Amino acid sequence: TKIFAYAIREDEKPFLKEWEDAHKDVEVEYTDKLLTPETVALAKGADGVVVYQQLDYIAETLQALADNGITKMSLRNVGVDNIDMAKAKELGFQITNVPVYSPNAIAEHAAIQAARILRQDKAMDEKVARHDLRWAPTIGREVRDQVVGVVGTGHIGQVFMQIMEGFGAKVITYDIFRNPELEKKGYYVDSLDDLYKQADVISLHVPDVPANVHMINDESIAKMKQDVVIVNVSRGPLVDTDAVIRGLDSGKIFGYAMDVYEGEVGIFNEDWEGKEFPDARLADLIARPNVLVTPKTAFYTTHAVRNMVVKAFDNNLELVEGKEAETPVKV
Amino acid sequence: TKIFAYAIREDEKPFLKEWEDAHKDVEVEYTDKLLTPETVALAKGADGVVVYQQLDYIAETLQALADNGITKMSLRNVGVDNIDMAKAKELGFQITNVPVYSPNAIAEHAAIQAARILRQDKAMDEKVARHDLRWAPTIGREVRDQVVGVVGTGHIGQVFMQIMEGFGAKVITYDIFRNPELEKKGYYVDSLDDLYKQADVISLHVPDVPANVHMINDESIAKMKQDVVIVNVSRGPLVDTDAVIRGLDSGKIFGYAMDVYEGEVGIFNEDWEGKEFPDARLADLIARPNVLVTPKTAFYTTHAVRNMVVKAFDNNLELVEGKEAETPVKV
């Protein structure tokens, strides 16, 4: 039994070893290269492949794999949108993914960034790096003094609620779908506008379905509290970036933490150092003293990455052994 | 009744307003100037003064206060080492301070810095600032994946324990005088050596007493776990700075958060920007990617500052009205 992996990172190696040590009867080989029509031959002789990439799984690429005896493909990540599904089904592909790996990775990133914005930690760091070691007038706002509003009460939103309550903050929440247990405990406000009215901090944990696109805009920022702190580690399109920049410029919004950005595709996770930066608006946000930009790294922890590796291999071995996959994808 | 205050900052004004509104019978006036022999005159007519400064309260300054009818002095801060006590006693002075203002201020700073070092947030920020938006290989460590060791279980230590537990970390502690409830709950280890062997994160919440001088040193760091994260928002002298630098340089210590620094007095809380910096070791610590230096700002939050203002005014009013002051200083 053999499994070939693509796009393996240094940081994924320890977990690959851990899976190997637990499945000594299975041969595992890999490369750091992406899966293309040219790299498909590296899989020749394997029973299935483990992949992870933004580079599309094109028809050509799926054909190259089929031609090399591969019809079992297990993704380490969540999204299956860059796969030619027609071709895959044409070829009899069985595809799996890793939908869940660490809600805490994302919730912790949201909490840390929110707490830093409240503290004015970046303003302090910029002063200190320039050797202005005066603390005043860069005063912090304690997490425990805030009313924290959580938009979306799924797995990630609930871990964020737990972290904020650990700090002693008052936590309130809004979701169009009401978890009965959270409702019993009294976490839910009567409306989204009610959350905007009450919250000092707002963190988004909902999908960007059509109704949520640009939910953060001129009109909702005008409803929010003075000195509101906005956090978005969920999806780019949730936020009208120009509206948040107007809120920052006007002083209505105290700060903004963004791990996602409408316009991120082809920019985030690329090295622009020494090159001309593609997006002036993003470059400006990066440099603001009250904005924290990260390039969609909320997922990127060792707990998460271990689960992305181990779960994908487990699923791939399942396909190979004719066992029911744990987290199958619909092809 | 009249109370005159010195060295009033812009951030303290809101809380001085709040104290006034609750004590409409008292007249309050202030200056942003420090209290000196010549500014002492500003308090003539007042019954008490409210102060906060590093500039010594010399025999001349106390004499001049007494000459303007003031022998009742209320500090908004903690420290009383810059007071000429022999003269104060001679002049019949009554003095108060504010020893407690917000444990959370300090505990939250420790928790935020710790989380940041674990995440490698500063290394990511530096890449993003240079326009390298690739997340790998700057992988984060979740707080919930750590064993967090808390040295000192007084009020601050206990808030830090609460925050870290809210993240889902395992919390262990050490205190020479165990809190009975924490003891019940099994938090304590029997020796610092046990805490060092077990902890991924160590945060110091103990005073600067003789037995704790240079408690973090080459020997204790050799006992610590590989990739230990060290946090000190307590007192400079707890830590042998060069021993931490050696641990950082060897890669033993994953990162260090310091809000205090042996030999920081005269350097911290001064502006050296565009000027010559007096400490090359500190300049290097400020600029390391896995070190977060803050200039004794753990106290500096709106909750803390509000309490420094209000408790100072309360204590002065008590002196003035002949009541037993809440937190008097032995003169």
Q: How far is B41 from chain A (nearest CA, A)?
A: 27
Residue with tokens 């490698």: B120
Chain A partners within 8 Å of B116 (Cβ) = 112, 116
Contacts (Cβ under 8 Å, ≥6 apart) of A301:
A102, A105, A108, B119, B139, B140, B141, B142, B145
Q: How far, in Å, CA of B119 to CA of A109, rounded?
A: 8
Partner B contacted by A263 (CB < 8 A): no
Q: How far, in Å, CA of B68 to CA of A42, rounded?
A: 90
Q: How far, in Å, CA of B245 to CA of B281, rounded?
A: 9
From the list B111, B69, B71, the residue with the least C-alpha distance to B87 is B71
- Which segments of chain B belong to CATH 3.40.50.720? 1-102+300-331, 103-298
The residue count for chain B: 331
Q: How was this structure determined?
A: X-ray
CB pairs under 8 A between A and B: 185
Q: How far, in Å, CA of A252 to CA of B266, rounded?
A: 37
Q: Which residues in chain A belong to E strands, given as ranges?
A: 2-5, 27-30, 48-51, 72-75, 94-96, 147-151, 170-174, 201-204, 228-232, 253-258, 291-293
Q: What is the 3-state secondary structure (H, E, C) of A256-313?
A: EEECCCCCCCCCCCCECCCCCCCCHHHHHHHHCCCEEECCCCCCCEHHHHHHHHHHHH
Q: Is the dihedral of CA A308, A309, A315, A319 positive or negative?
A: positive
Residue pair A52/A77 in contact by the 8 Å Cβ criterion? yes
Q: How far, in Å, CA of A202 to CA of A224, rounded?
A: 9
Q: Is B266 helix (H, G, I), strand (E, B) or coil?
A: coil
Q: Is the dihedral of CA B109, B110, B112, B113 positive or negative?
A: positive
Q: How far, in Å, CA of A222 to CA of A206, rounded?
A: 21
From the list B44, B37, B38, the residue with the least C-alpha distance to B29 is B44
Domain B1-102+300-331 superfamily per CATH: NAD(P)-binding Rossmann-like Domain (3.40.50.720)
Buried/exposed code over A288-305 (b: 16+ C-beta within 10 A; e: otherwise)? beebbbbbbbbbbbbbbb
Phi, psi of A305 (to 5 degrees): -60, -35
Q: How far, in Å, CA of A223 to CA of A221, rounded?
A: 5
Q: Is the dihedral of CA A109, A110, A115, A119 positive or negative?
A: positive
The residue count for chain A: 331
CB interface of A with B, residues 18-57, below 8 Å: none
Q: Which of A162, A292, A303 sits opposite B166 (nearest CB)?
A: A162
Q: How far is B311 from chain A (nearest CA, A)?
A: 19
Q: How far is B23 from chain A (nearest CA, A)?
A: 25
Neighbouring-strand partners of residue B72: B94
What's the distance, CA B285 to chain centroid?
Answer: 19
Q: How far is A327 from chain B (nearest CA, A)?
A: 24
Neighbouring-strand partners of residue A173: A150, A188
Q: How far is B51 from chain A (nearest CA, A)?
A: 17
Q: Do A273 and B132 touch (CB under 8 A)?
A: yes
Note the CATH number of domain B103-298. 3.40.50.720
- By CB neighbour count within 10 A (0-12 exposed, 13-18 middle, 19+ buried), where does A26 fall? middle
> What separation in angstroms does the CA of B205 have from each of A239, B159, B160, B236, B242?
40, 10, 9, 12, 21
> What separation in angstroms does the CA of A67 have from each of A34, A70, A91, A310?
18, 7, 10, 27
Candidates A109, A117, A132, A139: best to mutate against B (most CBs of B within 10 A) is: A139
Tokens linked to B86: 């022999």
CB interface of B with A, residues 93-122, below 8 Å: 102, 104-105, 108-109, 111-112, 115-116, 119, 121
Resolution in A, one decimal? 1.9
Chain A partners within 8 Å of B168 (Cβ) = 104, 162
Chain B partners within 8 Å of A115 (Cβ) = 108, 111-112, 115
Beginning with the edge strand found earlier in the chain, give each strand of the sheet holding B48-51 in spatial order: B27-30, B2-5, B48-51, B72-75, B94-96, B328-329
